[PDB]
Amino acid sequence: LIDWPPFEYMILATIIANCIVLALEQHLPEDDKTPMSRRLEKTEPYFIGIFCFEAGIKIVALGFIFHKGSYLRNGWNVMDFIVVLSGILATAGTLRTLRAVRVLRPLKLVSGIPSLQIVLKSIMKAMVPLLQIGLLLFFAILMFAIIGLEFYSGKLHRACFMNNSGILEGFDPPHPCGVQGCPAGYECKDWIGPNDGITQFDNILFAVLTVFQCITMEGWTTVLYNTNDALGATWNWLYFIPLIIIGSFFVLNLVLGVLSGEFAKERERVENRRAFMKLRRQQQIERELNGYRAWIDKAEEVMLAEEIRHMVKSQVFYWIVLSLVALNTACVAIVHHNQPQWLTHLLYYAEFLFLGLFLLEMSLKSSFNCFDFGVTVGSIFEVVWAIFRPGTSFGISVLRALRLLRIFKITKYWASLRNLVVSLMSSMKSIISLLFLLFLFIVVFALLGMQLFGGRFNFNDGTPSANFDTFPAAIMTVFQILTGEDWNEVMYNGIRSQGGVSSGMWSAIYFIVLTLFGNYTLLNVFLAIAVDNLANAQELTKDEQEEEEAFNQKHALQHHMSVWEQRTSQLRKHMQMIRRACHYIVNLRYFEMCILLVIAASSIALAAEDPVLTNSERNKVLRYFDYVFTGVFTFEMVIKMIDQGLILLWNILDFVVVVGALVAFALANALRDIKTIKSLRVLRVLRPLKTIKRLPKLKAVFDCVVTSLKNVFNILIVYKLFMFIFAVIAVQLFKGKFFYCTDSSKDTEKECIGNYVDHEKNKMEVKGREWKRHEFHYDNIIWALLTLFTVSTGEGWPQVLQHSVDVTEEDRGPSRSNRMEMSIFYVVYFVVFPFFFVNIFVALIIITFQEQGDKMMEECSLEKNERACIDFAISAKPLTRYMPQNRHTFQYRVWHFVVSPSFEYTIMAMIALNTVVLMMKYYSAPCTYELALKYLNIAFTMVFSLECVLKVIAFGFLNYFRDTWNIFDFITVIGSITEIILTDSKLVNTSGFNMSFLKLFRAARLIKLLRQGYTIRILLWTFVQSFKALPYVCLLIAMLFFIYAIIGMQVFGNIKLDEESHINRHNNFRSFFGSLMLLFRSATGEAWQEIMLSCLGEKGCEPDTTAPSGQNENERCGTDLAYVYFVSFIFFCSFLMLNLFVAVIMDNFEYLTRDSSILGPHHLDEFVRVWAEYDRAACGRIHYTEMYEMLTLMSPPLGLGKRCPSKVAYKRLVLMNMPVAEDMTVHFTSTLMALIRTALDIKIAKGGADRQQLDSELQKETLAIWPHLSQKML
Ligand SMILES: CC(C)CCC[C@@H](C)[C@H]1CC[C@H]2[C@@H]3CC=C4C[C@@H](O)CC[C@]4(C)[C@H]3CC[C@]12C
Ligand SMILES: CC(C)CCC[C@@H](C)[C@H]1CC[C@H]2[C@@H]3CC=C4C[C@@H](O)CC[C@]4(C)[C@H]3CC[C@]12C
Ligand SMILES: CC(C)CCC[C@@H](C)[C@H]1CC[C@H]2[C@@H]3CC=C4C[C@@H](O)CC[C@]4(C)[C@H]3CC[C@]12C
Ligand SMILES: CC(C)CCC[C@@H](C)[C@H]1CC[C@H]2[C@@H]3CC=C4C[C@@H](O)CC[C@]4(C)[C@H]3CC[C@]12C
Ligand SMILES: CC(C)CCC[C@@H](C)[C@H]1CC[C@H]2[C@@H]3CC=C4C[C@@H](O)CC[C@]4(C)[C@H]3CC[C@]12C
């Protein structure tokens, strides 16, 4: 059957049918079957027989034994054979090898369509460079887990329980006990664990799982608070804050940098260049053809005039039909719940009027029409459908608001947007294939989850909304886990369904793999799409706006590039191969400095303040300091106004700060309405912002941030328009439907009145009936926008999805899982905004990042990366490893046992065994086991101690310290010796201060094996080195954190701490550090919307101990300005984070795009080690014997590739200005610069006649480098 014209199509149809059958299965607990599932069970033998037939046709009629082109030698066919063979065994039992393996059946579509094979191959190829990053992740997870094992092991097993109510009860977020006891009539008692004994550091596996959950920023604050009340809140913050900073933010930065570098490198491949050239020529032909079409119409209009639809090409008509769209846009954006009765009638007539008018507009007739026709026909279908079945109206006329994007034509930003759309439309098959492949993998994971946890989530308190029972529910749960929101809560259910923490922990692997390969594969795919489609648009725009300049300069006849642009252009060309004394007093040298000190002092004073106790000694002294601060601030500016003459800028905020402070005690000391005083005193939080103008580097980074915002604003407009469209559609879907009664029995507001018995937590209670609304809803467009923003941030969106699914009708209480098709809206929203637009913003910031340090046009004008390499030649001192000089019986004899391969390998084995021992501890270990662990540490610390004292014998006491790593080893071993001495000696002990930190010195031996990792070490060092080159972006982020913390403390600092809310003893604005921790928690996005709601409205106020008054409560505190305060913080911080990451990525863009074929900075180490090894001591001289054999042993990618080009290579040495005129001259730097010129920027060999101008250019380009280069040239 070697000819299969449609055989493959029929097999594909069979696979599709099998996928559909697998999608209709429903899983029930305790061996229960739906009658539909029993019928579906009958279809399996047919599929098994068909697949057996197709396998037999390819085994014995294509080849199985002949190894060349056999059936099983293909990787994509062994999977098919495994699936068919395991399916056969399932019918032989008439379960893991029987039914749990048929979830790979959808993966047979990938092998069926080789296009999907190519797409998957590209996906995998793009993800290879991330592997090393993954290694750097695992070590980090290994590093902190061990630290968590030595401190938190077994410390989370007691909790406050005693309530004289049945040896039970306690707070819903249970309060673990510690070294201080319960605060009240509670007593410490044995506790299973925080998440039913799952979130803990008992052994290394639990610690690793907890650390992995924390680095994903999912519930890490709960872990932090569990150890805050179990061991005190003094040092726990020192473990979790770095863990998020290193494990989560740093890894994300590294992943983004590596991915962007790989995308830039791979955009210059031959096939990609050919495709882009094809697209460019298509666009150029279209551009030239469009202009000629104007001639045909203009001529045709004239002849008919001198012997038709000329009004539809005029500005007036194009503006009227665009203002009518704007009028329609506002018409649909005013619909809201409980709208006035006349407004409904007016809008009902307006929709008909607008539909008729737009039909009339169409009657008088790019793809503008191709989209307008679709919008209008959809509107007709929607209005016709609504009339036949009244009650529901999704709303599609709002899609015609997309025509408002045509207003960009009058601007100068139309070319870039049109190019972006053109590039996206050209590369649409690839995008569709990528989305389909992601859908296929999601389907496979949903089926696997249905097998593992299907029909197992109905516990005693009810089944969760995120279950794997039906296919829609399983796919929703898998999507939620992929987005990484509340995945730990699903993992907890998946563990306690397989047998609890005892024997169900193996089910965590599913969620770990899903989280990893959804967090990073999704980012890879979508960032690749965004980068490859935005760089193409940038190149098209630059080639379209530069061919008109050249043409215009020819019509008369007859380097602000970003780092990305420069690097990508260079990568391509290298691939083919009275006012008299006031002026004096303000112009003093030591004047601005004292202003900085006073501003910093005022900021620190703002930091130290109690918002609850208004009238205290500290607050009084702080106000007294504020008096002199505002006096000096008035004095700093009155001398400038009588100097610069007021207005004949940036210091407007300084003026408002100075003025508002005077009014602050003008009204306070005027003598009722004390609230205006507090509201006016929040102004002084702009005091830190006064340092931006004074510091020039801070001003530079602020200007860079502003320019980035200006660059992104154009796409921000489109993002806002799409968000508005979605919000308008979301209103028509869930307007007024987010209401519920406190008891599930009642459905409307009429019944929801009175009292009812509540049977929660196995306890009865009489509670009033309240007709409440969900906290986040879609009642109007502002609430819809806020809800969609919170969903886009990714916080609490599963709860909003559940509320939307429970939606039933206009004014009725929810019905569980009533409308499950409402999850289409959220899936589409997630695919569009957080998956595509955010990556568009990131890519646009990446590819349009202007260099900040240089800010110069012609720094070298020939290259950019070799400037460091050019200056590296004079800085490449042969730093030796300090070999012994004595060569005697004492120093040398022991030295041969240091460089010997027995010693180093033995030390590596000892390090590996020590790391194995470190993770061998667990809670409730036998006493003999702990004793063995203790004595094992003693053995290892002697070997490392002996190694430390054996190095100093050979290298030298003042010589062994010359290396950073040897200092680290000495400090580690000294700390370990101190630790073992202090806690083992019978009489040398302590009873007071706790020296428990010394355990870190024992756990800091992991970094030793970091010496083995070469590329990991280089990458880490490069990123760390480029982190300290920009110490003012971090300063800007710190300033934003400080300002927002001060604002929150001054505004939300007096809210009463209440449990069951998110402003409690753990999370509040009471102190500066508490507010800073709250802001960090919100930045990581834990429950920031819950905090925003809990600091919103008329919350009860903290009792003020001081300031006596004649009332009891006066007024409630807590503003309604919380919304802005959080919505502005989630944006700003995020932006300020992104502008940081790119600032680190573009600083190392030379490393991230290495192109290891003509590498020059990475090759310097090889030449350095060769020169060091050949001459034991440099002595400032080079012999005339080893040069002629240098190119042979030196790496092939430079100098010498083979014997055929060896003649050319040698001709690149002779017949020019040779240094061998004097045989005792320099022969290293000469051939180095010869190689550098030959490898890059060949400009002298071709000419070979003029050399003085090149020497002058080299001398003038390196004037301030201590110019001893007079002999380097020779
Ligand atoms: C000089 C300014 C600008 C910088 C330093 C400001 C801070 C550190 C100073 C200024 C005023 C000070 C307070 C003044 C009065 C009291 C009351 C008493 O219980 C002693 C400590 C306490 C609570 C001080 C703590 C430290 C404090 C808050
Ligand atoms: C793969 C990711 C991107 C999700 C893709 C969306 C598809 C596969 C999912 C998401 C929402 C799902 C729908 C949600 C609810 C319902 C209502 C139910 O009575 C029939 C099935 C149906 C109609 C589901 C079919 C599958 C579905 C359309
Ligand atoms: C270019 C952009 C603006 C296109 C946006 C398309 C979005 C808004 C459309 C495309 C698919 C649509 C969904 C398709 C199906 C359903 C099920 C129906 O019972 C309620 C509406 C709902 C849930 C639609 C809501 C709106 C929707 C998500
Ligand atoms: C040789 C090393 C590197 C293997 C990897 C270490 C892991 C898999 C080993 C090392 C020590 C082991 C622990 C030793 C003893 C017990 C006590 C038992 O009641 C529960 C399991 C538990 C807590 C083990 C879990 C697995 C464990 C943590
Ligand atoms: C160099 C390191 C990595 C080697 C680790 C292996 C040794 C030290 C470990 C592995 C197996 C362990 C033993 C396993 C079982 C028992 C029996 C128990 O009743 C007391 C502890 C005791 C006796 C353990 C002591 C430590 C032990 C011998």
Ligand SMILES: [Ca+2]
């Ligand atoms: Ca979250």
